[PDB]
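Exercise (ungraded).
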Amino acid sequence: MLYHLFVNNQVKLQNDFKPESVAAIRSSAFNSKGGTTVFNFLSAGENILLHISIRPGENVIVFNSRLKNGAWGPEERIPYAEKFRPPNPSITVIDHGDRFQIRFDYGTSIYYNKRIKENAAAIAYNAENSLFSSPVTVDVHGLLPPLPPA
Amino acid sequence: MLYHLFVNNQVKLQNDFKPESVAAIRSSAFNSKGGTTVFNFLSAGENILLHISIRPGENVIVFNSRLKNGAWGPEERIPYAEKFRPPNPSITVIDHGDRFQIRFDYGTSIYYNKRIKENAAAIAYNAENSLFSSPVTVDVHGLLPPLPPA
Amino acid sequence: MLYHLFVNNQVKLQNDFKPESVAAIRSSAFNSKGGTTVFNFLSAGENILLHISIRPGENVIVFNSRLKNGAWGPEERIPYAEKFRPPNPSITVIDHGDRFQIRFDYGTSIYYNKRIKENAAAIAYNAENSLFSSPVTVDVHGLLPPLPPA
Amino acid sequence: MLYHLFVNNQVKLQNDFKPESVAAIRSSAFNSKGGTTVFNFLSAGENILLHISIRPGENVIVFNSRLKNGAWGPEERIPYAEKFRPPNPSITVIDHGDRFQIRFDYGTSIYYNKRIKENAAAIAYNAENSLFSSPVTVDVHGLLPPLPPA
Ligand SMILES: C[C@@H]1O[C@@H](O)[C@@H](O)[C@H](O)[C@@H]1O[C@@H]1O[C@H](CO)[C@H](O)[C@H](O)[C@H]1O
Ligand SMILES: [Mg+2]
């Protein structure tokens, strides 16, 4: 399923993002002057199941979760440098049941253990000055699609 | 290469669209009450190499070409009904050297013999009330990619 | 649909290979000392709709057709060199209605106008000392599959 | 990289199967009357890193590991029923660093925590009466490839 996810907006998913689901987010641009750029996977109750905060200014990408009216938990941090490939950078998120896998354009996959036991009903995209295009292209799968060779 | 092509706008291609090239256009929506929706492949000199006029009202899709300041040639027409698959309809255009292949979601491909011997430098998208999303997602390849098994 | 096509053997297709169909043939090896290696697309009546004779020693690839009991027609020839990429070379055949498209690993596509107006029911593979593996992997599609971004 | 893995045989990988690697195993057949069918991922020292024993008669798929000259460890079991899709069933194995993901045609993936900390140098296939074709097609990637749309 193809969605166009606009900056400072969200897309309501046709079906729950749940174990086996794959979200392939692709940008048509890389804005080198972009600031903190965020993607959130939200439950129907607006709990933030997976928060991805890309922060060029701190050279970090931060992962976290929080309940709608609750506090942020411990942060899981990785370096920002050499993760994205211009001019079409990407983020791929896969739900593995007990954890999410997050893949950027370079480096090994990041794994983030689930903290809130709910499926996602929406994906949100926030930035005052995005690193990426508005919208981003998002293809969401219920399961890994058949793979091309080589 | 990924482009976001907005309605009543165009995208300037990073490289010439030429023999072997593939453009996969995908919409995030289908607006069944939409009106005439147009895609043009344009040369650097703004000649319309391939014009695709999708007309729900006349129940036809019209293919044509014209020079920048010239007249339209003879029309090539096919039925509009049962060509598109909501909610993510698509148009795939392939340059076969002597002719373009155009494939929608249903039916056999349309083949359109080239009339203007130039490569395309841009793709334009026009509609007052589009059948499709704005933008559409466009992936352009210099050659057919490795294919998944399904 | 996946088939394993062995040397000096054939595969009977589950469905007719007809307009829009795609056959992606892939080898697990390349024996550069191999001899003439042939693929045939056969109708139910055993007419050879498309014959591909790959001849390293003559430095040509020859395309032709013939009826079951018939003489070969005129040959359509291209050079052999600079077509195949080791160690997993490929041949992709697409039925465009009035002609076949044949793509190797390098170079522009070859187009071969249809001579016998029948669909293919089988694909055969013959060689005394094949350039390719036994079997080759063959994925056959009724229409071009959705394409990866790269 | 494409391999043809024959029954009661193995393939030596051109590169180590290691974190981020993907092996897509595809059969050209499903033999309904077939018996216990095994795939092993082996290290260069012939330790069995991942053993997959598919047992139609017992309605189970058993996962385990053992050193070359060592005994099996504790088993991890899942149901066999409705995991495979005729006529081209598949198994996809992905190395996630601390664990393997194993995905069949239906149901949720199986995750198997690594027991022996070595990369795999070969994949073996064993059966007296295989559920699957001989060979099976195996495409091995160093990283997840770009994904086609749904
Ligand atoms: C019969 C011809 O023999 C020699 O003249 C070759 O140089 C020609 O190409 C012909 O060879 C035959 O060609 C047909 C296709 O036209 C088949 O490939 C046949 O197997 C081959 O012997
Ligand atoms: Mg009009």
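Further reading is listed at the end of the chapter. For now, observe: Chain A has one domain: 1-150. Chain A touches chain C through seven residues (CB under 8 Å).
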